[PDB]
Symmetry: C5
Subunit: 310 residues, 5 copies
């Protein structure tokens, strides 16, 4: 029994983030728990101030006509409890619920180890014999407690796109609302656990440029190659199959190469030493101890610029 | 209280995909969230335009008789909320729900690393004292937002098989409807994380064809053998027990062989060098450094053709 | 309000398997989704054909008295939706539901890698002021679509034990019904991923019978010992703590021995070579290169027979 | 509307275990599925045998006053379905439900690999304007099918503590009932997969007492040290953070020491051999090959006695 | 239909912890199961002692007006069952429920291996046409059975902040109540499984200061480096991405350095021995065997103080 209008009914929205958590980098989701603020003028609900009780009159969701406001990008339907309906005298209704859903918005792991993300929540509304348009009421969009957690990420800013996008689906237009949560991953921890450890094994590998023994050199360069796989796999895990290349997956793959030519070298600095040509052999090894480190640091300036610098 | 017909009642179907996700290669499933469009002529519901209110009259699911449309290949029953019922004057009903289920359709990992899949959804309907036939109304089968995600896969095309298959179960025929989702796995990421890394260790292994030391050679060929197991196991995991052979599991198994004959060789290039016959020994090793690489690349053209080329 | 009989009321059962999946070898369970067919004569429900409407009269589960048919070996209560109740004129009721539960039946990993299993579903019924006996109606026990999946297993045959077992519990007898699903694990994949890889490392280990160097021999025999642990652990995982010995766990444990005596030997073929007694030393090593391989293949014929052959 | 007594109302309890499973050593829980038998005399429910229908009169849980019997040590509320209420003529009520909950009782991993445990279920009841006391009726406490599974454990005996413990909580006493399930872990499988494999690597380590080469000795003693970590970690996992020391965690830690002094030795049997003092060096190594094995077996008799023997 | 006051209505709270468990260090949560004690004077509920039945009159939650007391920091809504409502004659209501939720409170892994935590539960209440203030009634806040488990932690003290914080949200103030659970992690188990094992490999690494062989030294220092990664990764896991540095992650990272300079040394103690300068070479190695151990123990006193001592 919708409210009989003369034109499009405006439903006024606002989400107050109470809780954030379980951002799943693997599954591209995240859990949230907030308020849902809704307000619309239903004239049938007007009620003569002085003639009746107080300022406002509260109802049970049953009696009043209430808009169906579905969330778009949610795995399931949001488990919500109704906090309060307060019908103004003029007919203005003040609906308020506290929902709890897991939303589904994509993530760009382009600069993975260090990256900012922007999460979305959508809110559509299907129209019937009348049209509905949703729209934000910033005084409730302020959605953010000063205790919003979401570990591993720095929460930048929760806001909403004031202009709804009014689609037109299966005959009957709908009104969508974009709510936005910006976040910057807290890297750091990635250094002492991935970056640094992963580099040290790379360096230790090429102390085989100051060694003349093939045995201790295969042991040296190969043992570390393994550890880099241990790291490659470790990272490879908490991270989805992007169709594109990831910054840290680039450097981590480039590192595979330095282990190969490293071997190529030691394997060659051998076919020369035993080829009674140690004149040339220890010339190559002499070069390596400068080439490798330079071309690496060099290549990272190139690579890092390639990603962030562009 | 079914609508009294004169023949088979046609229920008109249509699924509008709103959300896709959680394709579980392991468990052969996937999660979806869409619209369910249903339409049927119930003559008892006809209602004299001018004599009553407006064009259409909305009901609560309770009052009207509504067909039971079960999904066939679903783990459980689909959690659905009813968006709208709109009874036309002639009696045409316009049912619409937004469901959310995990479907269960098989996958062919025949060309695993690079493979296309076709997902299914079924929709049956059991008949009573009357017969029901389902059938598509393409204007609602268009089921696909321009935001359909499903990570790691490229979504080809959502469509439906217009002709239902009318079984006959436990006395009382049913009408099934095949809805189809085609997808092509986004490989790529498999190269810098599996393919390439896995090859490099294979090459490094057989730099032992340019080495004359049994120690650094066992170290060489064996250490890498291990890493290939590390890779074999890693892949082996996110992948079910197919009764058939998988493309990447073929090459990954074929690789086990090159590590064996590699050892065979170095183990033999030793029983000869110490058998004061280094004439023959370094003849074998000289061969290996060409045989191995050729017969490999060679065998892949064979194998790859065997899979995709046929 | 049970139907007043003159003797034991027969409830007629039948399960039509629609979906199978999630056989958890670890947890000894498995998920199923089927029809539940129930039929019983309630004479109070008889209804004069010509005097009233049609052949049969459908009810809502509420009105009619309906038997409580609990599943015995289920983790929880089965999530079921009622498809149809159709009361015959004589009083014969035709109940039909589509349930979805995870059943709990044991598994014998005696011949693990290659083994057949028989799954169970139970269906009891508690009696009140009257006795109930359940019993199969094969025309609904046919429970099996030609699309029954259950990956990794070959589904042999779904059937039911026609004779119920009528216990007697807490005063008030019950009627249990054994439904049976036979399955044969699809091994195969176990070869190129466990069996073969696991053997190759065993062979490579004992190329140390054609080597005279203690260093490359410890490297050889030990490195592979490790990989066999990597395999031992890998298998050890997707497999519960049986109180008995498993076929593949037997060979995989027996393999541990060949790595020990292998070491014993190389460790001994050393205390002799350095004991200026290389006459004896290379006599032992000469033996090993025949003993080991024979006694192994030999022991497997013994072991394999021990399991399957008996 | 409680039954008006003259003193404390006795509610008669009894749990018939139908299903056991999912004992989580990690989380100290376990899942069960049983009957709940309750019986109490409500005199208002008396009903003149001959004047009315039959022996007993069945009700829907709604009508009758029924005691709230909460389980104490349960994660959540137990999902129960009501099987039957049968009011005797005198007023004796016969309540019966089939519940399904996960209980939470502690475990003592003191003798971990081989240990017996005793599981608990509690059943309290809060009193109102009258007092309630619970108490067992052994004829229903017999709770145990001859098919009670619970894999990996041998089920000893299900019984109940007949005397309730009547606390006094937030003003209003309660009656608690201790039900007990004794179980003995099926070890065995721990031998061929942990114990034995873990020992073999320990032995192989100290074949370095019959070797004079520092290289093959570091390779020997170190490689195995690693595998023992592989085992240490493997075990360390399916096992909670006890504040006390676990039997197998003791021996597994003690093993770490034999790998250290082993290294100490080989590292010392080197600083002597190169110190032109091989007289002393191969005296130490000669000792080790007897000391180590003895002091180990010796220390286990000590340790094992320390745990089980005391 | 709220109770008509003359000022702010005081609702009296109290949580009696019955069960604790599933503290997820990863997800910063934990599960609890307790009583919820609520009491408020609703004068409309007053009921003339002698004129009617007994002391108190019990209701079903339906009839009475009852405050909505939401938990703040909970993933979802708390699954609660209502134990008893007991309306006093004056109008004092005695509400009591037994809820079961997972709460979400942060954790400081600053001194991780050894650390105390303080868990929170919040309880807000939204006001309508009247104001509500919550407040503790210590006689029910005593929330703690003498069987409160929560494995791996020592439970210090459950208490509540008597003064509520009265916010002001979306127009309509609310009353929040801070309940506090203090806990001290049971470390210990971290020694024989992480600390000690992790140290032993560090020591064994630098027995390469008493060795003159580059091969057995790379083998020595590198093999252990790996194991420390095995440990680094193992710990790295059951532990979230803190933006700060963790005590055990500090020492575990500092350990990476001692493995690098260790290599630096052995790699240098080689470029000197082969540079016909063994005078200097074995001077460096002589230093190391004292420098390393000192500077380590030294650095830990520094580091440990840095964390706990400050």
């Amino acid at each position: 029994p919708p409210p009989i209008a003369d034109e499009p009914l405006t439903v006024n929205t606002g989400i107050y983030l109470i809780e954030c958590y379980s951002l799943d980098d693997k599954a591209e989701t995240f859990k949230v728990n907030a308020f849902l603020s809704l307000s619309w003028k239903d004239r049938r609900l007007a009620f003569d101030p002085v003639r009746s009780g107080v300022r406002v009159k509260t109802y049970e969701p049953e009696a009043i006509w209430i808009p169906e406001i579905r969330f778009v990008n949610v795995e399931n339907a949001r488990d919500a409890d109704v906090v309060d309906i307060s019908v103004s005298p003029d007919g203005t209704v003040q609906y308020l619920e506290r929902f709890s859903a897991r939303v589904l918005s994509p993530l760009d792991f382009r600069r993975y180890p260090f990256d900012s993300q922007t999460l979305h929540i959508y809110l559509i509304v299907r129209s019937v014999d009348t049209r509905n348009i949703v729209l934000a009421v910033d005084l409730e969009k302020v959605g953010k407690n000063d205790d919003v957690f979401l570990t591993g990420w720095d929460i930048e800013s929760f806001t909403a796109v004031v202009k709804p996008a009014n689609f037109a689906l299966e005959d009957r237009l709908e009104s969508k609302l974009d709510y936005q949560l910006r976040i910057s991953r807290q890297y750091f921890s990635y250094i002492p656990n991935i970056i640094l450890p992963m580099l040290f094994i790379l360096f230790i590998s090429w102390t085989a440029f100051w060694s003349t023994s093939y045995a201790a050199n295969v042991t040296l360069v190969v043992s570390t190659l393994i550890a880099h796989i241990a790291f490659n796999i470790l990272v490879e895990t908490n991270l989805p199959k992007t169709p594109y290349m990831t910054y840290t997956g680039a450097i981590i793959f480039m590192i595979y190469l330095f282990y190969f030519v490293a071997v190529i070298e030691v394997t060659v600095q051998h076919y020369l030493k035993v080829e009674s040509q140690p004149a040339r052999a220890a010339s190559i090894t002499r070069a390596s101890r400068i080439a490798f480190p330079v071309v690496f640091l060099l290549a990272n300036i190139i690579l890092a610029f390639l990603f962030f610098g562009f």
